[PDB]
């Protein structure tokens, strides 16, 4: 269409600009054949992982689903994880949520959107699991809180997969991370759950939930 | 692993530069609340979609899995599609493959990599479906061709989903595209399958396979 | 292997011992072509459902998975449910668990069994959801308790699917049930959740959970 | 609906004429703590597997889905398979289809039935793969030919899982079976694909398809 044509046009301009600029981008990219980080983010993709981290092209192995989830039985995401860990031997997996997430808003919404609702039912279970902390919070602020709690809960799901547990068990070096960034400042903020073993997973997980449960008198 | 640290050092340096330097990047980003294109790419993510298309930040709804697949029964991908079509009202779903795809290479290698092998079995089925064509090539050239055929097949699976078919049924405007770019120059290349209805899906899909089978 | 040769023998025997009688089992089946109940049970399949309900053959539509679960995002079971509801128009969906369940035991066990642990992590999430309650119970009981709670939580999951909500919402006749029979008794024990609409689902689930939270003598 | 009562009734009686009868059953059934067979059948479930095999109560580990499928990426069925193999040590996995199958008919009809159609696309793919054969066949015969072909294709899929390949690889005993019974007579019939290793799967699978490709006068 109009938009598709425009897109091919931008692509051509860019691609050839590189051609002329004798740009070494693609060659650089070719130097970093194997990625070192598995980035699991949201399909909203407000601020690209490349921009947030300014890493060298090819360093990131990416997976994106609605609301950056790691569901216990999702073959898709688990496939990406097992491949990044057992094959590419990646040592850092990073789950990253973001504020003003459509996935979060849709989950909290009472409208029944169809197939996607089922996928969002996992976020709702997370919402109620922390219903007290959240309810004890002002509406306008809950979204950002569920978004932050979501990340901690997903890092916790990743760390419990048979895949990740076996990696640690057999002495492989692997650390899980969980961050969130505000779509307005672009700053990555650690949510607290950071594991390098099942032990650190449990502790950092309890610790993060405990920290998030300590509310200021601003609600 | 000073990596994570160095990683946060990069983010701070970047977001800091933006603030003090007064960058309306987040201001503009905030303008485009609803995306207009669903991009289904590969987890290898060699050349970011944002770059390949040089689009305005926020315009793309993105899904990435190993080898840019649209498996008939994948709840993950189908959910992204249903939400994007039925909820965000996106009108263009773009499946994009890429040369030198590790996913495609793993599907071809005969080694048990574990869980991921089951995910790649779908690729191996596509390989057999086009075995006559692919059998004429060397392992090397076979990989480049399977990459292109894979994209065509995925577009074909996407257009066969009940989600996309019902969108066309009630008259919603929706087009499917399947492309591939070489990791060496970044030029996006149409593979031939472009649909706006079920009938056009069948026609272009057949024509595309017919065209791809000529050496 | 004799097991397969033997097994095939039984079949021939059964089948022939039917053909000679000019029996009508293969007729009293082609009449009940369309089922009226969707049975969702465990892969353990201790006491068969065709025997627990003594229903005429062909009346059940069945799906079995480890520990009878209805996971929000499981395409397999949601497909069975959707096809049951929207295409077969069946009106009753039963989620029947059973006592002394490997699934439940495996979920509670600390051992890492491989792939299946991931599927069981849903049971373990349920387990912690009711951590306090279950904690108070007596070990030899905890297992059987979770079995019961699990079924409750499964009906609630089923009731929360878009497939069932849209059914009700469009005025289609459909009820959800959740029981737990015992391998010894064989008596189907209703658990409390019996949604017929989303309002029901909420109340019954709410109560069923309240009822199970009231511990008796035995359980410490 | 009194159907639940009328049904709940049959249970109190049947289960009664076992207590007030000291009928072993629950006594014996309990003796078979572990099953030796994994049965993968269609949710239709015309003739139960308990009456088809006439095995001993509790011997079967069962999984049923629409049209008895083993989809490469189905977490549900792969979990049942893996558990039965790596944990229950079952050495026999049987896939059983049946004539006049709803899943097969629905898969062959153009009618978009909703979510289920996505599940059945895997069958339509099998249909296209054997399009020439099935085409040469006769209309009122296609359904049954695809039903047999389907069982063959599923055993193949099952033999190709990493779970099974690995079981074989480490020297575990395991055979795959693919049969189909006619709802009109309950006669179990081997479709030809029987495997005890990756090598027998291949030959057995190729032979079985070759045989089915042979069409008798009555299309
Ligand atoms: Zn988001
Ligand atoms: Zn790739
Ligand atoms: Zn069980
Ligand atoms: Zn069937």
Contact D114 C76 (CB under 8 A): no
Put simply, the answer to whether D36 touches C66 (Cβ < 8 Å) is: no
How many interchain CB pairs under 8 A, A with D? Answer: 10
Contact D122 B72 (CB under 8 A): yes
Which residues of C form the catalytic set?
42, 44, 46, 98, 101
Q: What angle do CA C118, C120, C124 make, to 5 degrees?
A: 110
Q: Is D77 one of the catalytic residues? A: no
Nearest-Cα residue of chain B relative to residue A44:
B61
Q: How far apart are CA D194 and CA B159, in angstroms?
A: 35
**Alpha-carbon gap, residue D71 to D73, rounded angstroms:** 6
- C102: CA distance to ligand 3 center in Å? 5
Taking CA–CA distances from A182, the nearest residue in chain B reads B26
B106 touching chain A per CB within 8 A: yes
For D195, phi then psi, to 5°, come to -135, 145
Pairing of strands A60-65, A175-181: unpaired
Whether C101 and C42 have beta carbons less than 8 Å apart is answered as yes
Q: Which of A71, A75, A78, A115 to mutate to test the interface with D (most CBs of D within 10 A)?
A: A75
Q: Which chains touch A (3 or more CB pairs under 8 A)?
A: B, C, D
Contacts of D187 in chain C (CB under 8 A): 11-12, 15
D74 interfacial to chain A (CB closer than 8 Å) = yes
With contact defined as beta carbons under 8 Å apart, do D152 and D209 qualify? yes
Tell me chain D's radius of gyration from C-alpha atoms: 19
Residue A61: give its domain's CATH number.
3.40.1050.10
Neighbours of chain B (3+ CB pairs under 8 A): A, C, D
Domain of residue A81, residue span = 1-219
- Among the partner-chain residues C13, C30, C78, the one whose CB lies closest to the CB of D183 is C30
Cα of A42 vs centre of ligand 1, distance in Å, is 5
Q: What are the helix and strand counts (H, E) for chain A?
A: 10, 5
Cβ separation D76–C79 shorter than 8 A: no
Active-site choice (D77, D96, D101, D130): D101
The Å distance, Cα A10 to ligand 2 centre, comes to 23
Alpha-carbon distance values, D180 to A14, B120, C33, C168, D189 (Å): 58, 29, 18, 37, 5
Which of A205, D166, A182, A5 minimizes the C-alpha distance to B11?
A182
Question: Cα–Cα distance between D83 and D62 in angstroms, integer?
Answer: 12
* Chains A, C: CB pairs < 8 Å: 53
Chain D residues with CB inside 8 Å of A81's CB? none
Report the catalytic residues of A: 42, 44, 46, 98, 101
* E strand map for chain C: 37-42, 60-65, 92-98, 175-181, 189-190
Closest CA to C87 of C124, C157, C34, C128: C34
> Which ranges in A159-184 belong to alpha helices (H)?
162-169
How do strand C37-42 and strand D37-42 relate by DSSP bridges? unpaired
Q: What is the 3-state secondary structure (H, E, C) of B114-175?
A: CHHHHHHHHHHHHHHHCHHHHHCCCHHHHHHHHHHHHHHHHHHHHCCCHHHHHHHHCCCCCE
Beta sheet of C175-181, edge-to-edge order: C189-190, C175-181, C92-98, C37-42, C60-65, D60-65, D37-42, D92-98, D175-181, D188-190
d(CA A37, CA B113): 19
φ/ψ region of C158 (left if φ > 0, alpha if ψ in -120 to 50, else beta) reads: alpha
* D109 DSSP 8-state letter: S
Taking each helix axis from N to C end, the angle separating D75-82 and D162-169, rounded to the nearest 10 degrees, works out to 20
Q: Which ligand is nearest to the CA of A64?
A: 1
Is any Cβ of chain C less than 8 angstroms from the Cβ of D19? yes
Task: Decide: helix, strand or coil at residue C173.
Answer: coil
Residue B30 CB partners (closer than 8 Å, separation 6+): A183, A184
Residue of D36, D46, D64, D92 marked active site: D46
- Measured distance CA(B1)–CA(A77) in Å, rounded: 24
Experimental technique of record: X-ray
Distance B89 CA to ligand 2 centre (A): 28
* Contacts for C1 with CB less than 8 Å, ≥ 6 apart: D92, D175
Counted domains in chain B: 1
């Amino acid at each position: 269409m109009d938009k598709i044509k425009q897109l091919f046009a931008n692509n051509y301009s860019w691609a050839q600009r590189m051609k002329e600029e004798n740009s070494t981008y693609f060659k650089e990219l070719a130097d970093h054949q194997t990625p070192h980080y598995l980035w699991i983010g949201c399909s909203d993709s407000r601020v690209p992982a490349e921009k947030l981290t300014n890493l060298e092209p090819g360093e990131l192995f990416v997976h994106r689903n609605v609301a950056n989830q790691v569901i216990h039985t999702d073959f898709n995401c688990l496939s990406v994880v097992q491949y990044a860990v057992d094959v590419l031997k990646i040592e850092h997996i990073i789950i990253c949520g973001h504020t003003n997430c459509g996935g979060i808003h849709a989950a909290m919404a009472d409208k029944d959107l169809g197939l996607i609702n089922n996928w969002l039912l996992h976020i709702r279970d997370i919402w109620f699991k922390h219903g007290h902390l959240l309810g004890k919070l002002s509406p306008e602020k809950r979204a950002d809180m569920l978004t932050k709690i979501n990340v901690a809960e997903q890092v916790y799901n990743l760390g419990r997969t048979s895949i990740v547990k076996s990696a640690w068990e057999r002495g492989q070096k692997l650390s899980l991370h969980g961050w969130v960034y505000d779509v307005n400042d672009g700053f990555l903020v650690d949510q607290g759950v950071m594991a390098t073993s099942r032990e650190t997973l449990e502790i950092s997980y309890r610790n993060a939930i405990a920290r998030l449960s300590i509310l200021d008198e601003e609600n």
